[PDB]
Amino acid sequence: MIANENIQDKALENFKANQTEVTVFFLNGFQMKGVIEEYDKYVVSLNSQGKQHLIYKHAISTYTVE
Amino acid sequence: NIQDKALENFKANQTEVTVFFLNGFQMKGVIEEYDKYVVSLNSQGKQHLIYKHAISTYTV
Amino acid sequence: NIQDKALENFKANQTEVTVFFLNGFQMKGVIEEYDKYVVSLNSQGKQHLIYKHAISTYTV
Amino acid sequence: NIQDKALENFKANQTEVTVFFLNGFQMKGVIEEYDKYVVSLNSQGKQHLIYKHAISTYTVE
Amino acid sequence: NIQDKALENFKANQTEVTVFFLNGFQMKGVIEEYDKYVVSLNSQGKQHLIYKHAISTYTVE
Amino acid sequence: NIQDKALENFKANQTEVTVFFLNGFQMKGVIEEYDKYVVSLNSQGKQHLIYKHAISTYTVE
Q1: CB-based burial label for B29 (10 Å; 0-12, 13-18, 19+)
Q2: Phi-psi label, residue B52: left if phi above 0, alpha if psi -120 to 50, beta otherwise
Q3: CA–CA distance, B10 with D35 (Å, rounded to integer)
Q4: Collapsing DSSP states into helix, strand and coil, what is residue E49?
Q5: Do C60 and A40 count as a contact with CB atoms less than 8 A apart?
Q6: Residues B59 and B38: beta-carbon distance below 8 Å
Q7: Nearest CB neighbour to B49, from listed A11, A27, A29
Q8: Is the distance from CB of A31 to CB of B20 less than 8 angstroms?
Q9: Which CATH number is D1-61 given?
């Protein structure tokens, strides 16, 4: 279960459940858009158009929606 | 703790802050929520969930 | 477990994987082996031992 | 502690310190406070809360 | 441990290896020593003590 | 310990060390002091307190 203080998993779990199209920005400023299919403490599985990406959280800067 | 107290104050006061990232890019907004690892910044009408590992500076 | 499952799938199927590094450079090759810290990627006739700390994404 | 002793000195003496970031940018100002994870640097009329993980070097003249 | 086995062989056999860094720069030489955190690389009239945290890739033929 | 042995040598011999940072910038100077997390480097008259997390390589001739 997710604690009220853990806003990261609350957000990721909602993105996952709702299949929302999210934009992931990386440390170098580049971005990819897709649906978060699964995630854990180290990685995020992002389903994009014609591409499947396995992203390390250590390389992520930001998530944004819309 | 300096950081925990600063973020608590930014959220409570709805302080406008510019977040600078490690690569030098910047985003100005209001911190709506935060936790030990991420900050949720509302900027230009949209929410951004930012990892603290990617933040360089908060400019007040 | 997500990571090991994907990496084992790439290795078992000799899948053409494009590795994006932290600086944004990309290298397309085949994963020959991997462990908790590194991945061995064969690309254009050369062997590359890559630290996972330097990887941003694996794309197929 | 080398680091704690320098920051202690910069703060007490209000030294003009130039902080270099990992990306090479630099910011010159005065250290107002610091702890294990952050440094607060006043520069050109504004407060800056800087993560030590993003700092490369402190340079003083 | 792929990395330790690889580094052990590179050192024992004086393998010419190219080290790429996180910023994409590269340096070719021979690994003379290494431990959990650093690699000592001899390259063109220079000795380089490199932190593994700054290494992206080791390439060999 | 490879790292400590090297830094001990550099400090004891006032060796001209070029420190390369993660972003590729370099600074040539003399190691005056160091510890687990930082290195103090004198260069062109100024003192620099550098975080090892921001260092890529120590290079010497």
Answers
A1: buried
A2: alpha
A3: 19
A4: strand
A5: no
A6: no
A7: A11
A8: no
A9: 2.30.30.100
Question: Resolution of the coordinates in A?
Answer: 1.5
Q: How far is E16 from chain F (nearest CA, A)?
A: 18
**CA A21, chain centre distance (Å):** 9
* CATH number assigned to the domain covering B1-60: 2.30.30.100
How far is the C-alpha of B59 from the C-alpha of A63, rounded, in Å?
21
Mutation target to probe the D interface, by most D beta carbons within 10 A, among B1, B2, B9, B31 is: B2
F55 burial level (CB within 10 Å; 0-12, 13-18, 19+): buried
- The chains in contact with chain F, meaning 3 or more Cβ pairs closer than 8 Å, are D, E
Beta bridge mates, D26: D20
B51/F36 Cα distance (integer angstroms): 26
Biggest alpha carbon–alpha carbon distance for chain F: 31
DSSP state of D53: G
Q: Rounded to a whole number, what is the distance in Å from the CA of F32 to chain D's nearest CA? A: 11
- Residue A7 has its nearest CB partner, among B22, B33, B46, at B33
Domain A1-66: which CATH class? mainly beta
CA distances from B57 to B36, D7, F11, F38 (A): 16, 18, 33, 20
Is there a contact between E57 and C34 if contact means CB atoms under 8 Å apart? no
